[PDB]
Design a protein around this ligand. Structure first.
Ligand SMILES: *O[C@H]1[C@@H](O)[C@H](n2cnc3c(=O)[nH]c(N)nc32)O[C@@H]1COP(=O)(O)OP(=O)(O)OP(=O)(O)O
Lengths: 260, 216
């Protein structure tokens, strides 16, 4: 299966420090049955774009810890060096050993260096910022801000930012993770109030302060533990449901087809 | 300041830059790239001389900053600088390449290519190449509307190609790329590649007629 949150993710960001091109992972033709044509990111697309700009990529650093996404030969046949750099798992940020490996590799290599993890934000930005600070004498503030502006809010894991500031600055000055854009969660699973009629005095509430408050008060009034609409949900009657009408008092009403 | 290649030892036929010619006519100082394993495997390709590695591994090693003596009185600096005999090297017929310059005319006619005649009584006769030789080829081109085979040397011919044909580049910056030429000028031949639509201007001699599909 294709990774989640990948279809809406931009393929590439702006180059960082004139050297690094951050990317989400490419997906080979093996995934074409799961990815519509407009959303495809074959490696050939990256190489063709670079050729169209008469730009060469010296090296592509793969941080995904897997070979199931695309064929490395699609990159290597174009004269681009390919390296699979294994990073610390379990959701932890890259180790000092991982950062030293990344720096040792990249200092060997004008041409761009492509860097990608599954989505191209957290591991990618962590390693790019580490290189900027340790090798190019950037401040960590500048590195984090620049990566945030190149690939939108580049690092959004709070512990990643905290560890970057612990290693290279003051941990107490680490910024909080950015608020995420709406496209991040469109695949996790209405503006018209009433369908077919236009209704006066009724205007949808998108104001961020009061929206959460109205939802919160409804939750607390219903005693609803989870997220979402707290109201009672009736279920369709079957031959095993109807026997319940004998087991306790019940009231009936006609159901008009309406909007809850 | 010439180039030689050593005869004996592990450095056989390796490019050595003649640093200083000793006037005693016995040995000369040679700049070499060490084919050593830094006393790690033995109890090898050419790679740069790593002084820190040979200081770490120990053994027969003496340090003088960048100057160094190691493993059988091998003298290196910054790059080996060791004396070797004139009779133990070949001082005639090395001719190193550009990659060796970074470390320290021509005729190419092929059968099937199309060439024209630029001078003489048989001028502007375009024919396909049959055979090839070294300097005076005495070619036998199959001209248009001529059943006979004439004779032309290399200095008289030129790789002329009609507009709109398969073209490849043999050497230079544009080598490996294919495509179609558009307009043939006096010597500037412009073409568009099979991969990209960028203008590539080449000399007439740097073109060949090959009908294979581009790799990409
Ligand atoms: O082959 C899979 C799978 O067998 C094994 N694996 C993953 N989770 C578990 C588990 O909870 N319990 C057991 N016994 N085995 C498990 O891991 C193999 C693949 O490893 P991954 O590299 O895919 O692990 P991954 O990177 O996905 O973890 P994470 O980085 O997403 O947190």
């Amino acid at each position: 299966k294709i990774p989640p949150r990948w279809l809406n993710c931009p393929r590439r960001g702006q180059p960082v420090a004139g050297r690094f091109l951050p990317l989400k992972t490419m997906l080979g033709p093996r995934y074409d049955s799961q990815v519509a044509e407009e959303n495809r990111f074959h490696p050939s697309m990256l190489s063709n774009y670079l050729k169209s700009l008469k730009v060469k990529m010296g090296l592509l650093v793969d941080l995904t810890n897997t070979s199931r996404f695309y064929d490395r030969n699609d990159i290597e046949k174009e004269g681009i060096k390919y390296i699979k750099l294994q990073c610390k798992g379990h959701g932890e940020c890259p180790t000092t050993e991982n950062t030293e490996t990344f720096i040792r590799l990249c200092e060997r290599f004008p041409e761009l260096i492509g860097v990608h993890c599954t989505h191209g934000f957290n591991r990618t930005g962590f390693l790019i910022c580490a290189f900027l600070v340790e090798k190019m004498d950037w401040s960590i503030e500048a590195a984090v801000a620049t990566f945030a502006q190149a690939r939108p809010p580049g690092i959004y894991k709070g512990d990643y930012l905290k560890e970057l500031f612990r290693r290279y600055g003051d941990i107490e000055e680490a910024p909080p993770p950015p608020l995420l854009p709406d496209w991040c969660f469109e695949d996790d699973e209405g503006a018209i109030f009433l369908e077919g009629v236009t209704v006066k005095g009724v205007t949808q509430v998108t104001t961020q302060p009061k929206l959460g408050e109205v939802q919160q008060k409804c939750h607390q009034f219903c005693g609803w533990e989870g997220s979402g609409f707290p109201g009672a949900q009736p279920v369709s009657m079957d031959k095993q449901n109807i026997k319940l009408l004998d087991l306790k008092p019940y009231k009936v009403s006609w159901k008009a087809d309406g909007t809850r | 300041k010439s180039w030689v290649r050593l005869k004996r030892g592990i450095y056989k036929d390796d490019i050595a830059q003649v640093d200083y010619v000793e006037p005693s006519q016995n040995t000369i100082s040679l700049k070499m790239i060490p084919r050593i394993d830094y006393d790690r495997i033995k109890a090898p390709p050419q790679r740069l001389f790593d002084a820190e590695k040979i200081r770490s591994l120990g053994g027969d090693v003496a340090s003088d900053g960048d100057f160094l003596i190691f493993e059988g009185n091998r003298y290196s600096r910054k790059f080996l600088f060791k004396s070797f005999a004139m009779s133990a090297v070949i001082t005639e017929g090395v001719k190193p390449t550009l990659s060796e310059l970074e470390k320290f005319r021509e005729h190419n006619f092929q059968p099937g290519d199309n060439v024209e005649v630029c001078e003489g009584e048989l001028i502007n006769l375009q024919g396909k190449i049959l055979s090839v030789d070294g300097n005076k080829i005495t070619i036998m081109p199959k001209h248009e509307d001529l059943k006979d085979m004439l004779e032309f040397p290399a200095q008289e011919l030129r790789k002329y190609f009609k507009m709109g044909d398969h073209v490849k580049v043999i050497a230079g910056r544009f080598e490996g790329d294919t495509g179609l030429i558009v307009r043939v000028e006096e010597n500037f031949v412009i073409l568009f590649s099979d991969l990209t639509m960028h203008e590539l201007k080449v000399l007439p001699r740097d073109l060949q007629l090959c009908s294979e599909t581009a790799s990409g």
